[PDB]
Amino acid sequence: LCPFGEVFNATRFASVYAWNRKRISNCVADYSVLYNSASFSTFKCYGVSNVYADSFVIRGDEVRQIAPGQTGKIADYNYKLPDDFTGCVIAWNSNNLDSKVGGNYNYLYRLFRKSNLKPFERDISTEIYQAGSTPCNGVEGFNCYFPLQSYGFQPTNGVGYQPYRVVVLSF
Amino acid sequence: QVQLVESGGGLVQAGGSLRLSCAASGRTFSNDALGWFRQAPRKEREFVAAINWNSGTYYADSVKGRFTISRDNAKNTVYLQMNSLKPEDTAVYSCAAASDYGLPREDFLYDYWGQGTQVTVS
């Protein structure tokens, strides 16, 4: 039986730009997660009505970008699902775990990339991004940006800016 | 395009009870999550209660113990039973539907919206 429990119950979750992948050997399907879909804010499947569990944190307003065919900073530069995705996307609000007073800066997202990610590609590099015409030479300025940014989650944020834990099951 | 129409709003006295209903068109009702939200003057929209395909439910803390959400798939209808009403419950209540097996409590994760019905608690 598939060890999905370890995936959902993990104490720590990755930043989306450094999204975590867990390979799960061929297993007896454990449907209890589906029957407990009420535990989650969203539970959607694609290509269903080789198992990977990918997981990470994003903000509430980005949950809709975790789906095939989406656009935006997350789908384009952080975590991209293919058009022929077969699997499920599950997410829940984690404000209780992942915000802190004065801001939790540990979760990051990539702002900029010279081209979009391919589906299931990851990029964790931190080269200073050249937004204008002069080379950056590793130095920040108004044309030269560190390519990641912190969410800064605070418990008092509105729900669209609260942290969400996401699990993507590909099978 | 799924049409949602709320019924049941009105004037009630504090401590009274009132049942809202929302009729949905569309063939996928039984798999959808259905939610209720409310908007009071000068206040921002707030989640009230929601039910998913498997009849699991979730309530805002402010209404737990007093309100009950339920669904009748044969009638494409969701209901909000509101007991022990306080004047702080006065609001326009709206129903929403989501093509989602989860239990969304966030307005941005719903897909279709009704028109609202007024509930006023004196």
Add this chain to the structure above:
Amino acid sequence: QVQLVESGGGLVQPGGSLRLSCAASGITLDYYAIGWFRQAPGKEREGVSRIRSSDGSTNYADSVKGRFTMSRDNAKNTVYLQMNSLKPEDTAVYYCAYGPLTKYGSSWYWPYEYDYWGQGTQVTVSSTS
């Protein structure tokens, strides 16, 4: 929550000065940047200056270095832009903006995106109107 309100814009002749204020409420992040930006019709928005709550350093756009100075009030949540030697090309709506810094390991980095923007104050540098 967060409110940013700019004031102090106006009309001045070339070579003149103005001081803009940005009154902020609701600042609760520990590690943040405040920026001044400007936008004119038909031009791209431009960063003008920025300051941060980690090390207090300030950066200025090349076009304004040595003419503009950004600072923090020591007794209220207001930041200033002192603009000296104004030029017609400085004409724009000036905005202040606030958002979190980026923590990467033990280092802090400047953001590109800011969470909150104010409503702008108009600065017009002109020999007439």
